[PDB]
């Protein structure tokens, strides 16, 4: 398998006003990431792609478009998790067929699964597809149990618990860790994470790569200055509405990022558009 | 519309070992509710029916079977909510076509929706189907906003907040409230709820109806004795595994309740089956 | 033993502007509760009395004043719980010496105590004083949620009589009456009195009974008689009052309502905001006009 | 002013079996921290010192003993926060009179205080004592989570120097250094020292530095030098020790580790479990063998 370390943008999807996928806009988002953000890879079908508001067929169309547009230029991970395990297996087979480099899967949600149920879910996706898997996160003993399956590569770490982060890095040194919190990239990199998967790399890739590299070189003061500017931008993005603000910033860079998908507010208000313009002037110009 | 007050069993579904719907077993569960539990209605496609682990087509098949088997014998409510609003509209149209008496819809989950997004979700399902709606639950001001749509009938109240319960009953006296916590039926009925939707009525209907009726007549000590026995049974059901224990209790009554659907543990262990047998002997024989 | 069932006001305390106790005002609050609110007893030294912001000597002074003013006319429970167990024993001995009918103690807080430590705390207060105990449960402030098995362990001590259930979990409330039918439960959420009375609580201990004790007794007694429609009507009016009290500021509003009836309920103690704003006073006068006139 | 940056142990206190202070043992703990742990200073009267279970006079006694033993050899911060603001002012005046370099105070807890009330509490302690203040933030115990704007308001008082960040939110930690670059931050989670040092904290205040202060200084200094691999190795060994300490019982295990080095760290104070079990003692000896020998 392809090297999966480094910076991965969690891929946003362009939607039309009626909720359907805007394919031309989706390819422009992808091209922006590969060609201008210079990411190491794309993480497709995650929360950032508005995945859980879509049908199985719509998820497959996004997987097809992303792989067709990215070809073998960068690494591609397909998030195929769901509350429906049969759907996760169907999506995992499809992504595997398309040539995705590995699968990822959120823990089954809506109902409360026990750990045994969560491990059986991941083992089932792996057994039925033949593909390697990135888990989400549970404690050290439970990661150990997950890691008894040799096709589990590591975890997309999205909880800000740096004690567990250190414990995992020590206990399972040959397993990978990708940071999921872009605003805490520096402290995660100080503990040796192997990469980061994030929604803000769709527009702030340049700084994200600088933080990651400066931190691994021990240049912590310089990395912190760039994390500070990054977090001023992230703070404004969160206050204005995360998904809509990143799309509006992409629109100012000539990327047809389109609308959000309903039940999320689909169209940005004038105020939201105004705030996006100010953010672009201050942090991305 | 049909009277929707009273006792509604949240319908469990019978699955085969491979996860597919066992239609004969599903009809036996339905017949048990109508003919022996003597419920006022069935609440189909909710959490209890393992709905969120299923495909759109599987949800439609369950709606078809339940309406075919129940005909017009009792009231039928169809839960059609989802994170995918287009799926909720598709399911709401189908249930409306089949003749369901009203729709219900969980608040969109997985992502964090704002109140405006939640209200637009409910208004969209109503506008696209033409059917009345039962919401889930937010505070008094937000229920008021939901209740500006005249086709919203009331709420399936699943949070144990009896202060909000009283406030809602006072503020919106012509809207209905169904209790969602079977173990707190007495206190809910003391505040005048119009009915209850619950998973334990699939086997404990008799006592549920007695509690509801004794409480409305002011016979609180007698209602409490029956709530105590009910809660001894519920306590054992929860400890042993809710969905699997109710199915195992149904099996002891000659109802082919089958397996649970994966990612939930599909098969009951011997210990779980043993505990179910003890529960049946102590509380349902 | 002196009956501890029924309607108990959680005694409010009158403070001077500098934070010291206003004894004359405290006595007026006590008299208002006994003579006008017609309470069965007073719960003294609880959260409502602003207890946790005071010194040990101030807590002793409030115990002394309350017992000297109430004398033997009503039942009196003394809340003596603290994070300092030595203080709790000192206060429990003092309240016992004064003649309080029973002690009560909040679960030790701040630190995350184990169940054996909580049980040892209760057992120590009882052993050192010789007095009976009511467990004071208030999860919203403490963060401590004890289950049914744990109450069982506390109840192995025969001097633990029951619990002040300042919580809204009515599944746990029912489980308690099922498991330990001979043990007492006092409801702590005034806005949920009807549903708690439907489950057989033996009484209620509340801050709003300092001004709304007439309606509170009615809800309790009507619910016990099975007159739910009548009880719910009075619970509805009561909760319109409580909703306004909570939005305007609980402590300061109840004290301003008492002031309007001629009770010198004084200031609140710092670090709480000690004086109401003009807007808070105006809203309290409207609540009095609408609900207590 | 006396430099307050660097490595501070959160002073543990030695108690006798009956709960009274063991002055000789307390002095031995102080000496161990200064002479062996090589700390920059001591944080006295915090959660680790079992402060919240003590009387006001006991807290004063610990302040007196710690200052008499440490004298002027190291920096000394006095935590004087309480739910009773009058007590906090009394303790702050006493610690100021003794010569403590700075005061610190936990956010008022138990009751749900408003932000204006919290700010008034800090402003009152400062005004009545004339001493500088460190805000003590410990959300896991208090339930109080202040945001960036609120820290801004507290920092309008020039005598508020910074915050003891006993929390793991590193987004908020970064936002604090961005907004208020001239204000100090001390990390409070010993197991997360490396990532906090990566974000520029000015020091650390920790309970485990009573026994692991040599490694704690190394992690801090190596991270500041950008030697991440070396720092992470020492953080890894440190966290194996901390993981065992937490599983065996934090307070009793650190006291037993101190006892094995000849420091009479004594018992814990009730309502905490005062004595370790045989199994706890045996596990503490193994932790000493593996990590502190």
From Swiss-Prot, chains A, B:
Binding site for aceneuramate: 47-48, 158, 180, 182-183, 199
GO BP of this protein: carbohydrate metabolic process; N-acetylneuraminate catabolic process
Superkingdom in the source lineage: Bacteria
Membrane-spanning parts: none
Protein's pathway: Amino-sugar metabolism; N-acetylneuraminate degradation; D-fructose 6-phosphate from N-acetylneuraminate: step 1/5
Function: Catalyzes the reversible aldol cleavage of N-acetylneuraminic acid (sialic acid; Neu5Ac) to form pyruvate and N-acetylmannosamine (ManNAc) via a Schiff base intermediate.
Family membership noted in the UniProt record: Belongs to the DapA family. NanA subfamily.
Name this polypeptide is given: N-acetylneuraminate lyase
Species of the source: Haemophilus influenzae (strain ATCC 51907 / DSM 11121 / KW20 / Rd)
This protein's encoding gene: nanA
């Amino acid at each position: 398998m392809r090297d999966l370390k480094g910076i991965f943008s969690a891929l946003l999807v362009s939607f039309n006003e009626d909720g359907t996928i805007n394919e031309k806009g989706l390819r422009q988002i992808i091209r922006h990431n590969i060609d201008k953000m210079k990411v190491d890879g794309l993480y497709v079908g995650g929360s950032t792609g508005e995945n859980f508001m879509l049908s199985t067929e719509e998820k497959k169309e996004i997987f097809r478009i992303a792989k067709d547009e990215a070809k073998d230029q960068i690494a591609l991970i397909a998030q195929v998790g769901s509350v429906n395990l049969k759907e996760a297996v169907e999506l995992g087979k499809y992504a595997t067929e398309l040539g995705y480099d590995c699968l990822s899967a959120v823990t089954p949600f809506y109902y409360k699964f026990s750990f045994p149920e969560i491990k059986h879910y991941y083992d089932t996706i792996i057994a039925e597809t033949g593909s390697n898997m990135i888990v989400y996160s549970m404690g050290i003993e439970q990661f150990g149990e997950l890691y008894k399956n040799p096709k589990v590569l590591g975890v997309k770490f999205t909880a800000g618990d740096f004690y567990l982060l250190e414990r995992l890095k020590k206990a399972y040194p040959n397993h990978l860790i990708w940071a999921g919190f872009d605003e805490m990239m520096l402290p995660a990199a100080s503990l040796g994470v192997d990469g980061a998967i994030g929604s803000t790399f769709n527009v702030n890739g340049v700084r994200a790569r600088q933080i990651f590299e400066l931190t691994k070189a021990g240049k912590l003061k310089e990395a912190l200055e760039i994390q500070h500017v990054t977090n001023d931008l992230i703070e404004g993005i969160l206050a204005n509405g995360l998904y809509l603000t990143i799309k509006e910033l992409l629109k100012l860079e000539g990327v047809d990022a389109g609308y959000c998908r309903e039940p999320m507010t689909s169209k940005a208000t004038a105020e939201q558009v105004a705030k996006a313009k100010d953010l672009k002037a201050k942090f991305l110009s």
